[PDB]
Amino acid sequence: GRTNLIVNYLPQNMTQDELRSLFSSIGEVESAKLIRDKVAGHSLGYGFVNYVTAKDAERAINTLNGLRLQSKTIKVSYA
Numbered sequence: 001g002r003t004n005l006i007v008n009y010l011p012q013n014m015t016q017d018e019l020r021s022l023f024s025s026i027g028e029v030e031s032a033k034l035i036r037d038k039v040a041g042h043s044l045g046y047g048f049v050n051y052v053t054a055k056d057a058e059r060a061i062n063t064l065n066g067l068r069l070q071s072k073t074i075k076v077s078y079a
Contacts, residue, residue: 001054002054002057002078003030003050003051003052003053003054003056003057004048004050004051004057004079005023005048005049005051005057005060005061005076005078005079006046006047006076006078006079007019007046007047007048007049007064007075007076008045008046008074008076008077009045009046009072009073009074009075010034010043010045010046010047010069010074011045011069011070011071011072012042012043012045013043013070014034014043014069015034016032016033016034016047019049020032020049023049023051023060026051026056026060026063026064027051027052027053027055027056027059027060028051028053028056029049029051029052030050030051030052031048031049031050032048033048033049034046034047035047035048048079060076061076061077061078064076065077
């Protein structure tokens, strides 16, 4: 049933389109949002990805959790 993911510990320089792309490699992404701070607009290094199907969301966690991007290991879990 769950399709909404939170993705933590993204590199500071990863763009919202790159976040979208990484997750679209697994299946159809309904939406992808990179959270930025409202004062200076810098990435806060986390985002939300919502899949069209629950099966794809589960596949995303299984595939992408723990992926090392630049200096850090990302976490992918249910929102």
